[PDB]
């Protein structure tokens, strides 16, 4: 509901978006660029199931997946940073499937 | 200068507020200052938007049950991870604009994170936080951040 309200959720232990989710992410990056948003930091996250090491690498791959979409959308490669926070920074409760759902994500951050 | 920096925080917040819409637009904007802050004293003295709507600010505790219903804006100071989680659990499902005084991370939590160091106050925006906030943010808000950094 507006380009600034942009959530990017992933399936369980999936580090790539599906055709429809990737499509919807593309028009987000398209929308951001059209309003001069220009540079982004991408931070991937996971639920707290599995090993720390797996999740960290998983969250890295999620963020890189989103980075590849922004690059394809026409945003300069140098203007994109990628981080994985693994499971360290949940937005929702991991003890419910609805919460775990919300933690499987990449947060788009716009730096000054 | 604490005085210079506090007034600049006031002006940047007034700028940010001008790009935000609340689903029920209140007659007065109510702002909660939460956690240790160094630059909020300008806010705490009260502010006025260009159209005359006032911003009334009060300090409130991290563990205030009613944080989400008692304010339209929260200005978040030094909170640890458990306190931050508590705050945003309170805000969940309520239309609340969140801004943190420090921007050392901006990974989870506040929609906007100030950087109150150096020449001009800048900020980052977390679009995932904006998405869970319940308020509407016009993308031109980032012009302000862009121009302040430059």
Residue numbers in the entry:
A (entry chain B): 56 to 167
B (entry chain A): 40 to 189
Question: What does the study report here?
Answer:
The tripartite signalling system YfiBNR in P. aeruginosa modulates intracellular c-di-GMP levels in response to signals received in the periplasm and is a key regulator of the SCV phenotype. The effector protein YfiN (also known as TpbB or PA1120) is an integral inner membrane protein that functions as a diguanylate cyclase, consisting of a periplasmic PAS domain, a cytoplasmic HAMP domain and a catalytic GGDEF domain. The third component of the YfiBNR signalling system, YfiR, has a key role in the signal transduction process by bridging YfiN in the inner membrane and YfiB in the outer membrane. YfiB can release the repression of YfiN by sequestering YfiR at the outer membrane, which requires both membrane anchoring and peptidoglycan binding by YfiB for full activity.
However, only YfiB(59–168) could be crystallized in a complex with a C71S mutant of YfiR; attempts to co-crystallize YfiB(27–168) with wild-type YfiR yielded poorly diffracting crystals. The resulting structure to 1.97 Å resolution reveals one YfiR monomer binds to one monomer of YfiB(59–168). The interface area of the complex is 1,053 Å2, with YfiB burying 1,024 Å2 (16% of the total accessible surface area) and YfiR burying 1,079 Å2 (13% of the total accessible surface area). YfiR interacts with YfiB exclusively through its C-terminal region. Strand β1 of YfiB is completely unwound, allowing strand β7 of YfiR to stack against strand β4 of YfiB in an anti-parallel manner to form an extended β-sheet spanning both proteins. Furthermore, both Glu163 and Ile169 of YfiR, which have previously been shown to interact with YfiN24, also interact with residues in YfiB, suggesting that YfiR uses this same region to bind to both YfiN in the inner membrane and YfiB in the outer membrane. The extensive interface between YfiB and YfiR includes a number of hydrogen bonds and salt bridges: Arg96 of YfiB forms a hydrogen bond with Glu144 of YfiR and a salt bridge with Glu163. Met59 of YfiB inserts into this hydrophobic pocket and interacts with the lining residues such that its side chain is 5.3 Å from Phe151. The choice of a C71S mutant of YfiR breaks the Cys71-Cys110 disulfide bond, but the Cys145-Cys152 disulfide bond remains intact in the C-terminal of the protein upon binding to YfiB. In this arrangement, YfiB binds to each end of the YfiR dimer such that the N-terminal linkers are situated at one side of the complex and the conserved PG-binding sites are located on the opposing side.
